[PDB]
């Protein structure tokens, strides 16, 4: 239907360029842990 | 009032307004005729 | 003191490569607004 | 009319890659000042 198929592949490439470069600068992705919300949820529960 | 630390990106301006730009900065600003459109580009260097 | 001076410049470059590539994938940086904490702070105040 | 729209975006990217790389090699763009032509114009006027 859409000729855009190769423009989907052209998105993937820079993502790899982005991801690889991000690891060099030590920018941390997937840092979300159990810290704030549940404590607030505990406070909101009380 | 702030001093520009690094050169600003060029912007399009008229010849009359761009020559005026030069009258303030002149060591710190840069202006050129654009041959096709006859107008001028105004580029502020560092120290403006 | 440290000869590392050009290794500081070599960090800056990929950062520009990172930043430019990140804008292409529409990954939004500087998204933090007033949403969660102050509401929790309001709840924690009560 | 023309499907080329994303091929216009694909031109912009390397331009940024070009511009950023050009600044590293200290290749100076927008160097044209008042030097030659008006002097010649002054000479051509006389």
Q: How far apart are the first and last CA of chain D?
A: 55
CA A37/CA C37 separation, integer angstroms: 9
Determine whether the interchain pair D3/A3 forms a contact, defined as Cβ–Cβ distance below 8 Å: yes
CA distance D1 to chain B (A): 28
Q: How many residues does chain D have?
A: 46
CA A4/CA A11 separation, integer angstroms: 11
CA B17/CA B32 separation, integer angstroms: 12
Q: Which residues contact C10 (CB under 8 A, 6 or more apart)?
A: none
CA C23/CA D19 separation, integer angstroms: 17
Q: Is B19 on the interface with D (CB under 8 A)?
A: no
Resolution in A: 7.5
Per DSSP, what are the bridge partners of residue C42?
none
Q: HSE on the CB side for D38, CA within 13 Å?
A: 5
Method: cryo-EM
CA D7/CA D5 separation, integer angstroms: 5
CA D24/CA C13 separation, integer angstroms: 9
Interface of D with A in 1-46 (CB under 8 A): 3, 6, 10
Tokens of B45: 């260097």
Helix (H, G, I), strand (E, B) or coil at C3: coil
Among chain D, residues having any CB pair with chain B shorter than 8 Å are 30, 32-33
Q: Residue D32: list chain B partners with CB under 8 A.
A: 32
């Amino acid at each position: 239907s859409a000729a855009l198929g190769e423009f989907a592949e052209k998105v993937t490439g820079p993502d790899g360029v982005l991801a690889s470069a991000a690891r060099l600068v030590l920018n941390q992705l997937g840092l979300s842990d159990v810290v704030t919300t549940p404590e607030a949820a505990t406070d909101a529960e009380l | 009032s702030v001093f520009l630390d690094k050169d600003f990106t060029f912007v399009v301006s008229s010849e009359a307004d761009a020559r005026a730009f030069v009258q303030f900065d002149p060591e710190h600003t840069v202006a050129r005729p654009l041959p096709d459109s006859s107008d001028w580009e105004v580029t502020r260097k560092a120290g403006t």
